[PDB]
Amino acid sequence: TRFHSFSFYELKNVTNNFDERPISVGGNKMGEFGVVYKGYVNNTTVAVKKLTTEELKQQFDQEIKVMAKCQHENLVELLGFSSDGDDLCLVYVYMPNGSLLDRLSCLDGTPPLSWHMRCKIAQGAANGINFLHENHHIHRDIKSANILLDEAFTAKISDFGLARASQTVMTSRIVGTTAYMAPEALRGEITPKSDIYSFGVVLLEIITGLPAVDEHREPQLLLDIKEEIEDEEKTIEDYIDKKMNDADSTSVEAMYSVASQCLHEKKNKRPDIKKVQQLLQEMTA
Ligand SMILES: Cc1nc2cc(-c3ccn[nH]3)c(NC(=O)c3cccc(C(F)(F)F)n3)cc2n1C
């Protein structure tokens, strides 16, 4: 439709024959169910994601199905694709500032995100999840690594390969990232309410600047700090990222309130994305 059909050979020419060397050393590999390569079509920089074989083809076809129906400022934009043999490629609009994970970790010496930018990213990401949920899709892998940032640090949700259409069902194949996954999701339930839980973990990543899981940490899983703060063992202020100078307590506590609500172990007691949107909008009012 709107999507250009590339040959693998065209995308090989765009990506310097899919140079797996990092962009920093002069290759085309930017990040990693596949590797994301930098591409040049004319005067447009693009991101080329090269991905069981029939199950990969389903994730490919799903991404195209979702990206065909879902177009929104807080979602990545598919420019085209390539289906030539056992080599499946998806071409998107280039995101100059990479993933939220990378920027929260200040990877490659990038400056720390201000509270103001962090609040806009949270709102953007929420607006993107709202669009997917309004259009009866469940992401099933909402994480900081799947939230990409454009030139204006506008949040764009990515990776809809495992996305499901939405009456809560169950699955034999349990997918997602443990550190972000809700209890029912880990048990095989498929609900948009599980996406909310995962976002709660992302809101804690934004507040703390800490990764969802760290082997050499206590607690190892970031979601466990909710208990420490509820059992008055620690405070939110003890966990607030020290790499910010513009974080007012009222606003940080307000985002934690949403994160805590999002992270209710009872699916039905979690807020819907529309409420998450409203609460985060009120936070910046
Ligand atoms: C310095 C730097 N690091 C980067 C990391 C990624 C990155 C992290 C994880 N996947 N891709 C990235 N991604 C994209 O441009 C992009 C854009 C749209 C869609 C995708 C898709 F493939 F994920 F669907 N990727 C750009 C990056 N830049 C410019």
Residue numbers in the entry: 163 to 194, 197 to 215, 222 to 336, 341 to 459
Task: Quote the passages of the study that discuss this structure, keeping the authors' original sentences.
Upon binding of the respective ligand, TLRs (except TLR3) and receptors of the IL-1 (IL-1R) family signal via IRAK4. In this process, ligand–receptor binding is associated with recruitment of myeloid differentiation primary response 88 (MyD88) protein to the receptor, where it interacts with IRAK4 forming the myddosome. In summary, IRAK4 appears to be indispensable in TLR/IL-1R signaling, and activation of the IRAK4 pathway is associated with inflammatory and autoimmune disorders such as atopic dermatitis, lupus erythematosus, hidradenitis suppurativa, and rheumatoid arthritis.
Further SAR exploration (details not shown) led to the identification of compound 41, which exhibited reasonable potency and good selectivity against FLT3 despite lacking a larger front pocket substituent. Compound 41 inhibited CYP3A4 (IC50 = 2 μM) to some extent and was therefore deprioritized for further optimization.
